[PDB]
């Protein structure tokens, strides 16, 4: 079963949770079209040129637009960008570990 790539905007539901094992859990809400769809996600450097982080959640998907999705990721130490969704209105979250 193939799913479309989410084209629309995402919103952070609550404050990003930090786990004791050096990971972060981001709870997002989809505002766009095409659900069920894959959540575009990437942890990058501040220059947005290299992939630095690791996604822990296997294939983040919006099952229903009305239900938020928990995304677990492992950011690198120091400064990084959490990039959620495609442009326009792409979430670009600053993160410091």
């Amino acid at each position: 079963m193939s799913y479309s790539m989410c084209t629309g905007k995402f919103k952070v539901v609550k404050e990003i949770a930090e786990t004791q094992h050096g990971t972060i859990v981001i709870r997002v809400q989809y505002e766009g079209d095409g659900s069920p769809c894959k959540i575009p996600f990437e942890i990058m450097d501040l220059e947005k040129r290299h992939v630095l982080g690791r996604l822990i959640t296997v294939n983040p998907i919006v099952t229903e637009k009305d239900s938020p999705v928990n995304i677990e990721a492992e950011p690198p130490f120091g400064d990084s960008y959490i990039i959620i969704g495609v442009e326009p209105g792409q979430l670009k979250l600053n993160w410091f570990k």
Partner: antibody, heavy 121, light 108 residues
Framework: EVKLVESGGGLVQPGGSLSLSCAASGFTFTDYYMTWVRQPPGKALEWLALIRNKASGYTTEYSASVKGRFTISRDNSQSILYLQMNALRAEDSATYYC????????????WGQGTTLTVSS | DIQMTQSPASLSVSVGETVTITCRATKNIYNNLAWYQQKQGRSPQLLVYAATNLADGVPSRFSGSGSGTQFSLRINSLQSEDFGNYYCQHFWHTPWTFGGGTKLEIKR
């Protein structure tokens, strides 16, 4: 079960107005995005307008070809989709289809039989 | 905006042969792509959605492939009922543009 029946097609003078309707049945109307697609004789299909479901606040989108002239609307009590067409021109002559989208606007899974519009003097 | 180009414009293929038709997007659309069939004097019908999923009631002889900018529709051991027009459509940002179409005709 799922059925879409368009009506309202006919002959209109250039600059005139016409309203098309699409009677929907066999599904929960408010749960689905609805669309209008047209096809001029011997030409390709053209997406014109969309109307979102209840969850998305029934918002609309239009192609640049019809923006400002056409209005998509829905009667959620009667499960009817409408297309209000103003300032009609010869290039609006086509078969008009009303469609249901499968995944929140994506993939036109059900189409009506179509209704024909002719814009001419 | 993203434009959709289909190839070939027309083709004649015999019953029982396998056919592949292609669709190209001007920009990356991942797998947000649909294929439709339209027979003489009838409404278009959904064949493939999300580039590879078969729509309800579509025979398994149909198969969609591709991700990004290049897509293919394959018909294995094609039948007389498969002849007609084929359109691709993207589902990225609006407008959701259709390709110009490919006319599949019967070789006899």
């Amino acid at each position: 079960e799922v059925k879409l029946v368009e009506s309202g097609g006919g002959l209109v003078q250039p600059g005139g107005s016409l309203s098309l309707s699409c009677a929907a049945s066999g599904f929960t109307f408010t749960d689905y995005y609805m669309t209008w697609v047209r096809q001029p004789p011997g030409k390709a299909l053209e997406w014109l307008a969309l109307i979102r479901n209840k969850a998305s606040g029934y918002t609309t989108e239009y192609s640049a070809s019809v923006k400002g002239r056409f209005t998509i609307s829905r009667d959620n009590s009667q499960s009817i989709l409408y297309l209000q067409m103003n300032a009609l021109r010869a290039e609006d002559s086509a078969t008009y289809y009303c469609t249901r989208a499968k995944w929140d606007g994506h993939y036109f899974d059900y189409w009506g039989q179509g209704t024909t519009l002719t814009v001419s003097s | 905006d993203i434009q959709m180009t289909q190839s070939p414009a027309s083709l004649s293929v015999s019953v029982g042969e396998t056919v592949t038709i292609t669709c190209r997007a001007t920009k990356n659309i991942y797998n947000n792509l649909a294929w439709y069939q339209q027979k003489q004097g009838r409404s278009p019908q959904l064949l493939v959605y999300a580039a590879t999923n078969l729509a309800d009631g579509v025979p398994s002889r149909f198969s969609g492939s591709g991700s990004g900018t290049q897509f293919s529709l394959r018909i294995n051991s094609l039948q007389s009922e498969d002849f007609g027009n084929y359109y691709c459509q993207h589902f990225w940002h609006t407008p959701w543009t259709f390709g110009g179409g490919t006319k599949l005709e019967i070789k006899r």
